[PDB]
Subunit: 258 residues, 5 copies
């Protein structure tokens, strides 16, 4: 039960940070990239390596202790993808688009996703191929059945660990997440162009239809993201996912609850 907002100078606070992408980081020079993608011979034999799998990013940000029951209420978000212009590097071991041409820029399938919540993002598992063998060191839908290719309600989890939950197996659970606001776009196809807007003049309001934002349990704010921008194609044609960091600025206020 939600009561009144506290006012006064001490009543507001602000969280500011960035979440780095977790694309797989196949070697010490390739932070922000995945391993080159290879294709299994069959559905049965799909067995991606961990460094080939982009994962959800998450940060748990402690807020000023509030231990009347008060909670921090997240009200507004400003967010931005950081380093969008890095994708103009078309002179770095890329594949020429045509004889004597510049390198093929990063493109193809993208997923841009962010959420703000008063607890961990709740996830539902959905598998493209239920017979995929997910690698050690990732957290993936377990006891998969063919029904996992459409909906298996056993696959419930919390986004509670960084570089662990592969993007391709998990989505926000729309049956839960009442105390989180999430937003995402998947743009598919191998040739889709990245379209990335930046400005410091856009704010998202996080209040629901009753004027209540995410309420931070135990004084923690949960920020989550995925920004798979597309694939980089190298000179020999191997393709790697490329990700970028996401900025978050969230304003919170103190709210009394019963």
């Amino acid at each position: 039960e939600v009561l009144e907002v506290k006012t006064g100078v001490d009543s507001i606070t602000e969280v500011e940070c960035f979440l780095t992408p977790e694309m797989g980081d196949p070697d010490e020079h390739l932070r922000g990239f995945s391993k080159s993608i290879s294709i299994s011979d069959t559905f049965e034999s799909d067995s991606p390596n961990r460094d080939m799998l982009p994962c959800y990013s998450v940060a748990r940000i402690p807020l000023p202790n509030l231990n009347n029951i008060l909670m921090w209420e997240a009200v507004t978000l400003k967010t931005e993808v950081i380093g969008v212009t890095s994708l103009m590097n078309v002179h770095s071991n890329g594949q020429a688009t045509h004889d004597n041409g510049a390198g093929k820029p990063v493109q193809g399938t993208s997923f841009h996703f962010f959420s703000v919540g008063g607890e961990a993002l709740e996830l539902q598992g959905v598998l493209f191929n239920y017979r995929t063998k997910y690698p050690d060191g990732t957290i993936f839908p377990k006891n998969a059945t063919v029904q996992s290719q459409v909906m298996n309600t056993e696959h419930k989890a919390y986004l509670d660990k960084n570089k662990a939950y592969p993007v391709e197996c998990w989505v926000p659970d729309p049956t839960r997440n009442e105390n989180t606001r999430y937003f995402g776009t998947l743009t598919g196809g191998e040739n889709v162009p990245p379209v990335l807007h930046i400005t410091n003049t856009a704010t998202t309001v996080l209040l629901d239809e009753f004027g209540v934002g995410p309420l931070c349990k135990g004084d923690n704010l949960y920020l989550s993201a995925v920004d798979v921008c597309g694939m980089f194609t190298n000179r020999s044609g191997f393709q790697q996912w490329r990700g970028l960091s996401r900025y978050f600025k969230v304003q919170l206020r103190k709210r009394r609850v019963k």
Copy 2:
């Protein structure tokens, strides 16, 4: 029905929340959510699709708490479930070029949902009136060449799962007064899927008189199609790929005469 006032009080509202699985054809025990690979007849006359190559409309009839009062559907939140699964470009796909990743799901899509107080009303329209639709499907009967544009004989209710093929039926715009429907067809073999997800978006189901669908016999009807595109295998064979759809509907008690 003459529509009178809304009931208030804590008992006066209820909520339905569920998901509808897609019915893309399910050609074997490992391929739920996919169709059979798509083949092409040599002529219009010989068009004879397998049942498991034809995606169908999904429908769920949701019983509501027993109630002259009727449940009125006011708001919908909906969402395609599992959008990220289409990032699996490593599973038996066709490389886009030498050493490349697999071609992702792409091509013709149909995304559709409806909320109604009775079954969705369908009108039959055939691409090719001589198509032979297979046993187990419910399809436009006594088809003529006029069925390729409009034959008013082809009326039906979406009253059964895995039955009504997507390609030969649409919502009947001459009926459906007690239903709200929304759909988009995006055609072309290279169309990129564009799938948005959020829990912050609500659709209001009220018509221009402030009246939502009224649930006859205390049943709410949900229907959906989410054909996302085609998956292309190593050999170039293509299968429709679908995803489940979440519905959350809020309803209120309304008195009627």
Copy 3:
């Protein structure tokens, strides 16, 4: 006419609901909704399309209850009927690559509709003024080279079905005071059809003075074109494919002097 007050009361409103079938050329008894395969002239000057290769504007004139009072058209709901039929990619199509599904309908599209209290007024514009338009169609006569850009002699009324070729005529923006019209041409050979359906969208037909089309002689005129794109067969021959359009119009009685 001075336009005076709207009449109220039970008798004072009416509704029209119908569908217009597309007129794409209909080359044989099995191919309603399709044009003949398109062939290309050997030279610019020898362009001579056959009648069954030329999509035409559709038009219906709808009698209203007999009534100075005039029926005033206030709102429109409209929808393309049978959007899902374009998922038939298994019927005499051209494979998009080896073992692939059929190339779906795509390419140049024109979706157009109008509602008026008299016939839609047309202005003729020709791609090529030396085109020989075929007998049985109504086309810009006495064409000159100016007809490729603007020849004000080419005026007509859309007063006949299966007659006015889409490629020759557009709504005349210098006239049509008593009609509301809306169209989109999307050109290019691979453009993807994007077709939205819903029963929740209404267009208001009133002008800036709050006045809708006034139906002369108690007739309402509906017009449409819905060339969705081209179908490509196995051998690569291409034909226009069209679909029917639904109209629901609400009208009220208006007094006039």
Copy 4:
């Protein structure tokens, strides 16, 4: 000094007309097309022929003789003949074996303006060493700076079939007494997207509630509607343009 609007029966008027495109008109049969486009052998030798260069269209429309001035308040406009681009049977290049002709497509520029005096132009050159042909009005004394901004290149759109589209844009440092709108969509496979309706009005009033004030009782209308390129059987490409409809409502306004 703008004062009040005059009301009453006599105080409004309306202009209605069509501007034809000026695409180059390479022969007596080819009104609305350019000459087939050829490509120079090098950058320094770029020398387009006149009939290969689309130009800005302009009409100066006399208004009822009137201190009062006609003030332009609203505009309805659209491209005339959009359906003509469905002719894919007229000696085009087949998209594939047995296919229909390739439709008009590729780079487009759609532009219109309404002003109480001639549109003011600023010159910018893709390649300052382009020799523009006799019979066109082009930026003079071009330098390498003309490729980005050379403020010497100022002109008025005061003549039809004369100012090449590729050389000139509206001058954003001027045109206080004009409203202009344009979109360039570039790329050889760009599909035309053309909307028509008689239900859309553009308001021409500025933030102070004042529209273009017509000097000398003349209204200036300008347009470009390069819809794309038509590809002939043999691969040669010509710009194709279409006419634009204008309807402008004007009201009498007192001025000091």
Copy 5:
């Protein structure tokens, strides 16, 4: 800075109007507005771009009427426009024919369109596609790069305080700073991406923040920044060059008292 009332009166508003020229690299005396042709390194380690192959941010510091009570000029509105959009219709100047007998391939592919108005220099954060890229002499670039610089390294902070210097590909606006600037940009990537460029003199952007305050011009200087890489020009032989265009700015300012 405690922001107080706006001054009114005839002498209390002013206007700045100008154009920023693009800085694409200018590889020779005939190629203002173009980059050098793009070449591709065989490894990430060996990426060493020449200066004239690297587009850079444009910046102008515009002196305002002197105000030295403390008054500061406050930027309130912006009109802006890319100048010369129609130049991209030159498909006849030694381009690569799209097909036999066809016109020249128009400028297309990756674009970045960006503008900012601030009361002090735009603040930048460095991000690198490839941390081992060696940026050339005469450019100002992220120093002491590490592999973390490919995603976020907070050491890479700078001010856009010099023209023809800050390469577009390694710097973005720093979202943790820029309180006294309003910035807007769009990256559209992909080699076949069609330029879509709108021009009009009827559009205005309001520069006021959620509290009604616009950029306050420190030292009576207005900072304008821009990038307008429109795509690439492909010549006959297939070599590709970036092509940019100038940007118009008209900014209205008012006098604002501060404590």
